[PDB]
Amino acid sequence: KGKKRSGARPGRPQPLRGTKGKRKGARLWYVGGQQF
């Protein structure tokens, strides 16, 4: 259960850079080979 709040992240906003988590794992896409 919930508690301390913290959006008080002192900083100027940064443009969203990348929708891929923090820790990844196994492979997810199979397309027949490499695709850039």
């Binding site: 709040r5 913290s6 008080a8 900083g11 906003p13 969203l16 923090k22 492979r27 199979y30």
Partner: protein, 426 residues
Amino acid sequence: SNIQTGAERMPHDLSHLGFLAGQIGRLITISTTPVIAGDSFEMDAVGALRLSPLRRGLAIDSTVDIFTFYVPHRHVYGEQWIKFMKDGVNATPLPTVNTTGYIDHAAFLGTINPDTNKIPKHLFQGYLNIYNNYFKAPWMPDRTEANPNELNQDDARYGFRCCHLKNIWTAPLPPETELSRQMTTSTTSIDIMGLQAAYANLHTDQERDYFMQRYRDVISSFGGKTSYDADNRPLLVMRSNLWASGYDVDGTDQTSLGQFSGRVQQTYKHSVPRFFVPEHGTMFTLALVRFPPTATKEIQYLNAKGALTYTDIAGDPVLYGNLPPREISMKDVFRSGDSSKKFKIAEGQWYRYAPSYVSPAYHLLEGFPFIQEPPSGDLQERVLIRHHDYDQCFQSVQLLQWNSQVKFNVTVYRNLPTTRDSIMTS
């Protein structure tokens, strides 16, 4: 054939971007992740909170609350879910609630409305449970709609109205608080012993009225505890609170030199520590943006209710410590207060609270998030925030009153086979 009977738990990256927008006092879903029994969930939401451009420079920070709740499906489908799990593979598929035909009519659940117009009932019901257990005033009736299509376009698109931050007027005692209690006495005697008893019963009443309207509270009162399963309540996993701010933009042309526009950019971070999911459910994350309830016409109770009696002005502790709740009207604390709109206050409350002062020069001045006329309506309409009270505060934009761009870093330690275990027959 032999099949791939197991799986080994490994980290699943369910991270995603969030492009959000809402109104001021409405609770809106900004992210949802369906969880499986036995997985471990963790999230790091980091983004920026922006308000629509305001008409003049910054004057007051707004406060932001971000919440993450867990709602087990059992909680939503009850018996039906239990049976589904037991039945297994041939279980009858789960019920789906109905939405109104519009793209934003399921937006309160942080989702685009499918063309078919239906969504999983757990998504709609979980929201109601969250609202009814932590956001409505304890004394208002639960929200009991069967399908999202029963909602107005503002509830459906922007989320349900939340209450204002507590005030003398914003947080009055519950509506039915009794101001007196009769003991039916006989004509020329009273039973000294019954009287005693009379007091014991009222006590018990009084406590349920003021602090225990909810079953879970009545038990804590006994010094016992109740699981979230005991009363079916969504479990609050994490909550972050913050004040959003920014800076003013100085105009510099011939006509707007001396003029400013407040720019609220607020970097925030919502972190949910690892969480073990005991049974299949959804993890709901919601946002609520609010301003302190500053009205441009609230008066100090002693300055607006006539002639002052000894009871009102002296601060006599024996009086305040011993008389019934005082019933007051919206007119005792507001310049255009409806004398017909009453509320019960604690005696001496006026000495425990101080309203903010807004000089009359600011009354209809656009660009300040102040409430311009005193809320008119029943107790419930006055405590529930009305987003239009803030319309004259901002520049008119397509992204409502606040917008956020977040990166939901979410890791789930789940146990399902690999995407290829999955696409390989052998």
